[PDB]
Amino acid sequence: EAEAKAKALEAQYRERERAETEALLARYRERAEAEAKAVREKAMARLDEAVALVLKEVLP
């Protein structure tokens, strides 16, 4: 029964581990998509300026 009880632990140990680690991914990924967007968004506004600047070096 010291083996048995521990067997009963194991289930949960794999399950809870699975469920959470798998869940952690959801949280990260779906936040990754978002955070990726937010550096795009910072640029969007002040973006034009970049083109303008870059264009200016190349032009003469």
Next chain:
Amino acid sequence: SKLEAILSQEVEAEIQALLQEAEAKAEAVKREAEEKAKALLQARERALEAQYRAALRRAESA
């Protein structure tokens, strides 16, 4: 008669000594188990938790 009475007198206390030895021999079997079962299961609790958390941690590292 009394002669064989001494033969009696010898046996009865021995019956009790078989028992006293015996009593200790059941109890010890019982107690060998008590510590052993408790002590492995602790280790297997331990082990299972760590073998979980460090994965989730490493997952956090992802």
